[PDB]
Amino acid sequence: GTSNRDWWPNQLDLSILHRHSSLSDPMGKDFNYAQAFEKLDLAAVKRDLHALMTTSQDWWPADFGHYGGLFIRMAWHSAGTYRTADGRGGAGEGQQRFAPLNSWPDNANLDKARRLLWPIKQKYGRAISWADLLILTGNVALESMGFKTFGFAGGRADTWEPADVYWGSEKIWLELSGGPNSRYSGDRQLENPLAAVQMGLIYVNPEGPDGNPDPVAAARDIRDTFARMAMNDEETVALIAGGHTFGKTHGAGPASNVGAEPEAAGIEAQGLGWKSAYRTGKGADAITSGLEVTWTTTPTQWSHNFFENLFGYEWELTKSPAGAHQWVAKGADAVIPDAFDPSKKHRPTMLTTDLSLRFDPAYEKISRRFHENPEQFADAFARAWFKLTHRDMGPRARYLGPEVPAEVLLWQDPIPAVDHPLIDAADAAELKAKVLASGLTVSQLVSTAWAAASTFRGSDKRGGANGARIRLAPQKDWEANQPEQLAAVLETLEAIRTAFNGAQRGGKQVSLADLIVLAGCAGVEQAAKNAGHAVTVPFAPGRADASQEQTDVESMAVLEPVADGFRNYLKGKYRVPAEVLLVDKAQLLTLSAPEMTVLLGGLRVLGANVGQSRHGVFTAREQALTNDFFVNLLDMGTEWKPTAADADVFEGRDRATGELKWTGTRVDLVFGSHSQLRALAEVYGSADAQEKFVRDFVAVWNKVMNLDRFDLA
Amino acid sequence: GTSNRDWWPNQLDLSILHRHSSLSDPMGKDFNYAQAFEKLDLAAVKRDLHALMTTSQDWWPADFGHYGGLFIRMAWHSAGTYRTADGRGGAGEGQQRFAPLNSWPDNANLDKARRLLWPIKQKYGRAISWADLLILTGNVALESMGFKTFGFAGGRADTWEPADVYWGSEKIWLELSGGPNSRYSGDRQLENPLAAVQMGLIYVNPEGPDGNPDPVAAARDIRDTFARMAMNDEETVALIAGGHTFGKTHGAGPASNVGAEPEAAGIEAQGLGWKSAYRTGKGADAITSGLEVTWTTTPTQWSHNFFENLFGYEWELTKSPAGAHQWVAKGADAVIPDAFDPSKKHRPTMLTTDLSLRFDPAYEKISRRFHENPEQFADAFARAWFKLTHRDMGPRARYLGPEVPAEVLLWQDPIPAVDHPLIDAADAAELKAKVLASGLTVSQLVSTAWAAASTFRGSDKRGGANGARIRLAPQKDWEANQPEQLAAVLETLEAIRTAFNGAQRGGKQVSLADLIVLAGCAGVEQAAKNAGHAVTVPFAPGRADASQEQTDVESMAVLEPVADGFRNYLKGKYRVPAEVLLVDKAQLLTLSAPEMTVLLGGLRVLGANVGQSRHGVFTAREQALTNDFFVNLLDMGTEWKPTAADADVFEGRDRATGELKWTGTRVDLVFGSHSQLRALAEVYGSADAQEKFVRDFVAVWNKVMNLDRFDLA
Numbered sequence A, B: 001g002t003s004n005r006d007w008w009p010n011q012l013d014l015s016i017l018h019r020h021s022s023l024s025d026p027m028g029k030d031f032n033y034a035q036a037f038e039k040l041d042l043a044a045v046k047r048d049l050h051a052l053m054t055t056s057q058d059w060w061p062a063d064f065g066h067y068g069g070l071f072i073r074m075a076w077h078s079a080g081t082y083r084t085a086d087g088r089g090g091a092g093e094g095q096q097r098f099a100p101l102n103s104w105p106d107n108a109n110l111d112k113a114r115r116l117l118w119p120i121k122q123k124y125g126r127a128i129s130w131a132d133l134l135i136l137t138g139n140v141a142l143e144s145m146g147f148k149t150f151g152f153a154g155g156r157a158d159t160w161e162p163a164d165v166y167w168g169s170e171k172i173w174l175e176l177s178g179g180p181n182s183r184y185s186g187d188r189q190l191e192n193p194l195a196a197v198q199m200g201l202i203y204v205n206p207e208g209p210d211g212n213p214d215p216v217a218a219a220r221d222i223r224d225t226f227a228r229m230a231m232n233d234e235e236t237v238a239l240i241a242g243g244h245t246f247g248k249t250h251g252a253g254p255a256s257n258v259g260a261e262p263e264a265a266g267i268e269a270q271g272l273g274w275k276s277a278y279r280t281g282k283g284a285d286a287i288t289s290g291l292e293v294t295w296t297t298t299p300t301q302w303s304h305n306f307f308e309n310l311f312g313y314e315w316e317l318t319k320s321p322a323g324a325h326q327w328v329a330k331g332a333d334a335v336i337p338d339a340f341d342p343s344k345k346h347r348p349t350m351l352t353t354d355l356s357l358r359f360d361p362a363y364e365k366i367s368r369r370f371h372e373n374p375e376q377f378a379d380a381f382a383r384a385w386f387k388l389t390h391r392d393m394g395p396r397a398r399y400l401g402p403e404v405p406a407e408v409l410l411w412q413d414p415i416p417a418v419d420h421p422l423i424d425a426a427d428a429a430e431l432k433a434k435v436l437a438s439g440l441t442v443s444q445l446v447s448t449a450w451a452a453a454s455t456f457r458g459s460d461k462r463g464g465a466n467g468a469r470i471r472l473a474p475q476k477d478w479e480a481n482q483p484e485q486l487a488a489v490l491e492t493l494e495a496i497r498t499a500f501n502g503a504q505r506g507g508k509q510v511s512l513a514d515l516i517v518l519a520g521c522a523g524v525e526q527a528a529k530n531a532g533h534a535v536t537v538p539f540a541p542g543r544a545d546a547s548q549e550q551t552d553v554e555s556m557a558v559l560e561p562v563a564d565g566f567r568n569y570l571k572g573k574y575r576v577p578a579e580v581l582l583v584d585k586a587q588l589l590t591l592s593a594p595e596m597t598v599l600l601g602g603l604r605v606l607g608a609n610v611g612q613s614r615h616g617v618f619t620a621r622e623q624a625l626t627n628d629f630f631v632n633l634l635d636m637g638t639e640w641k642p643t644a645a646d647a648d649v650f651e652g653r654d655r656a657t658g659e660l661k662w663t664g665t666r667v668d669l670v671f672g673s674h675s676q677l678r679a680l681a682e683v684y685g686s687a688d689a690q691e692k693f694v695r696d697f698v699a700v701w702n703k704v705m706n707l708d709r710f711d712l713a
């Protein structure tokens, strides 16, 4: 059946804003996963998982009699799709079980691993999500094999449909770079927001870049992709060598024996895929990656044998039985155990990407330190493994259960505890009046609070106004944030705050984070009064102020808005049209299309544009909260044309006289062009809409202000 | 950006079940359009619409000074997409304003029509939907030009995103028949559910079949497509000749001057399309269809001139200025007015498809009767126009406002008014006990009520249990309904009913329609007791019994389930796979995926399959309401394979012994294969889920029982 996407393949896709409705969710509207998880007997689940590790099923026999390596791979792939550019991917929604991730070539046979966990999932039911279970099982694997983990937090609620993630534009699985949809340009520059080298891989190609088995060049790809997943050199070496302490690869025969991935398989496969015609199709005959490597002499026990082997042998290039490039130790004895035949042993083997850890000079230094000091290795791997598997969980307030590590880590963007009484509703009213008496304008107030709160992204739950990081580096100097104007606003608010806090008894105080958001609330209320409407904007106190020392400036960089259609801002020229960037930002803010539309139209007339630009400011009462954006946009008395100077800026002229009335960008005018967005603009541009527009605007403003408030959740 | 649909283009699409969520809807959850409409000043709207008719705008000047013809075409096309096969299409959701219908070639320049209505829509706001406005406007056009309409009902609520309708598989607009995705096979057999001859047309091609100008062969396509839109020969000739009493076609120059349709146009077009480079691009120079025909000597006034011209001249084939085939009156004088130049007149002209009304022998007789008896023509057109524009509105209880016709029409599937006291809760309990004491089984009770209620489709709001049409022709003889079994159940229930009604005072009685549903509810309660659960199933009385004479047997045929996955039924072998048919039926029932899943799994164990088939009956306690379907389907101890006799039936065997445990169809096993369905099945197949399963089953059962109950809305 032909679809709208077929006829108009470049039209903007709004469905991404309307996923995850209560319609697709089987749990009641009142289901709260945190409350369910908090009563789980986590120790009981862990004992069942520990038993499972050595209870082989004949439909997917356990290598070495132990499924630990397979489950560690499973958990690492759950977490390993994460990209810092947009926060998308990661383990936090259990998306490995839906398309496309369930059927990526790098996730082959993890379908088997998830099916092994069904009995445990079935037993505990809604009290443990799949998303938490996948990570918990990797921790139990590690513990069962002698490795002490850093801890574990539950709280990843399950989702019920595929997420809409851009994984690349290639139309062929695993396509090598340089094709018509190449994700590389220039001198091997990987396009943002991607964090893998080929479509369907987690990070890199285990044979080497585009299959070329050069460990030095592979290391460049490892470094780049791991940095795009928030991991530095030490973490990367710790993770790779730690993972490949355990288990083995599978490549017993040619890959052409392997059948359809799960999404393509027949209905009788019951959700499994990659059925293999090679010998038994499983166990000793398994084919997963096509490589046939076993790294250590004790694949089911933590050890420091990965680095003993990497450094204690010289390595020769060889081929697996499927034809893939891999490496074998020169002159070695057969010291590595076979996975099924206790009378067979093998020589040590490595991947090209393992050898990167020795042949890249910066990795080599770290790897040597870890080989000489395996306790340093164990600590680094435990911390990295926790970070990897928790990186998208958000604020520490979301972490549940009895195994949460007490140590606060810088990468968590931590927020200090509040240890004093909070302001009450009368205090809030007193503060709003003091803010408005200061001479700060509606535009300044709304622009500052928007700048602070709109860094939030629901993909990894980073950002938001909690912390008052807008006053710190690097946020205070982002161009979208208008650094000089911002500094002036913050100075005036800090004086208000000092004066209010100086006059209190009993230890009551207000944080700057709270006062920024409250001051924005005062601006919106003043704008509504300017329009003739008395409204109260809700406000919830309890934010705290983070220090510079608790703020990792380099990790904060990915939160910089380079496109923010809500402020009519674009830092430079991109290949993706600005309206598509707007919808992407709306998705990160967790907004529906109605919410996006009201929010944008209100922000335009409040003065929120960067640089006081007049684009989309379709009103003659700026700083009054009215629906004028929509009424003027939809007025058929105005004709619009792209300017000769800039095709992305439009002039609105009176159709009868030619007189210039307005200017706008693509982000402004999409609301009058896209058939779904224009239907929404019509509701708000109608003669009966003024009250509705104000109420809906207040409600989406308060939603945005509260996005990171998991302390209240 | 590669999507799951690109990778697995035949996987099943569940998003169709989760459209129209509260997320994409700008109106509050509590918005009730009926209540808004009932306060509209409809008279005021009609005055404004009458004013609009001759208020020409320079960006799309009015032909003859009067927009009436354009607006009639607008309303006829709004309604004209309707198909009786599935009830999809029609005017009832205002979908002409969204993709793809906003950009179909047949709807060219109706964008202008809708834009002319923006000021009225803006002025009245939420109190008149677009969907109602489009129809009201056509009515006012007719009244303005001297035709008295049969009436009008409001109550078409607006929708907010494109609907998921199968319009065909062609990848080229207007593709002629016989291509790789032809909608025709055999002897010009149009594929169900389609009701148009080419992709992007409303019914037929005005030049003739695949562009061949043969009025006799065109008539065959007219007849078949109009029948697929619920119209017989009389209605068809009335509608065509009535419409083509008014206005004109547009084809002043070659079609190559016409630019991008609305969804393809640039953002500066602000939702309009088909911009033309031919002369002024508009008015006298307009190009819409490419034909240049004006049918009558007074195109802005009702007349009897259509049939005087059709019969009064002989016709010659000619070409418009765009090259299209059309017909001109041999030897006529220039009697037809020009739309813009008072000094030009034209000869009478006709489309191929107009000539069909004279040259097809069955239409000729009707056309002649109408030419000789113009009052019969007028009355037929008025009634057909009402039917056309109200066909998808559902029961008369949905019809709102002061212009609703009092006459009950057969095509509305009318339900008699209830004029007696209803049964109360004590009476319901007494009747449920009588039903359970009669010896009717769980399976018979559930199957009968499901058969009755599941005819409902939310596309056109036809069917459902109200009316007790399951006891009449043709429902009583449908194979899916198990006629012999059904007859036995109905006889027992009618004897219960007769006995209960015989014992009452005060006029209280129970209808058979209510008793069938209540008997179903007793079955579900008995099934829950059989499982050890104490459950009450909600029941709302108030259904009435329709007569055979109130039930048009041929119109009822399209409600026959030829595929009903909920009863594991398929009437024969189709090209569309059965799990796609299941999702389609779920959409018609208005079910979400979780609701579809719970419903099916419960019905399987209750004995609702047609013919007592064991397929999908994954329980050892049939007729008990348990989650066994899910627990057994997901048991990895069972291996599934297609049978050698039939690739659409699967055998489930114990993995270790090979012993046969179950059989199932594609509809059964999809729940264990599709990654989203299987995530839902897991919830209900968990150890903590038995009570949740039961309570969710009851809720969805009740939902289905009440789908047609707009008397309670």
Ligand code: HEM
Binding pocket: A063, A068, A069, A070, A072, A073, A076, A203, A204, A205, A206, A222, A239, A240, A242, A243, A244, A246, A247, A248, A249, A250, A251, A287, A288, A289, A290, A291, A353
């Ligand atoms: C450069 C990065 C990495 C590359 C290219 C890579 C490559 C692979 C490949 C090709 C396999 C074999 C799949 C099979 O045939 O079954 C695999 C297995 C495995 N990897 Fe990695 N790996 C990477 C990093 C990681 C990390 C970070 C971890 C965990 C911390 C991990 C843990 C594992 C484990 C445990 C297995 C064994 C699975 C089993 O026993 O079934 N790897 N790796």
Ligand code: HEM
Binding pocket: B063, B068, B069, B070, B071, B072, B073, B076, B203, B204, B205, B206, B222, B239, B240, B242, B243, B244, B246, B247, B248, B249, B250, B251, B287, B288, B289, B290, B291, B353
């Ligand atoms: C066999 C069925 C029909 C065919 C092939 C057909 C074809 C068309 C064509 C090609 C146009 C010209 C569009 C343009 O160039 O502007 C048109 C115009 C029109 N049709 Fe039909 N028609 C059909 C049935 C209907 C029916 C059922 C109605 C209404 C009851 C209707 C009412 C109109 C009116 C009022 C116009 C004039 C539009 C204007 O004045 O702008 N037609 N028709």
Ligand SMILES: [Cl-]
Binding pocket: A088, A089, A090, A093, A095, A163, A165
């Ligand atoms: Cl994601």
Ligand SMILES: [Cl-]
Binding pocket: B088, B089, B090, B093, B095, B163, B165
């Ligand atoms: Cl529809």
Ligand code: NA
Binding pocket: A087, A088, A089, A090, A092, A392, A458, A459, A460
């Ligand atoms: Na994420």
Ligand code: NA
Binding pocket: B087, B088, B089, B090, B092, B392, B458, B459, B460
């Ligand atoms: Na419909």
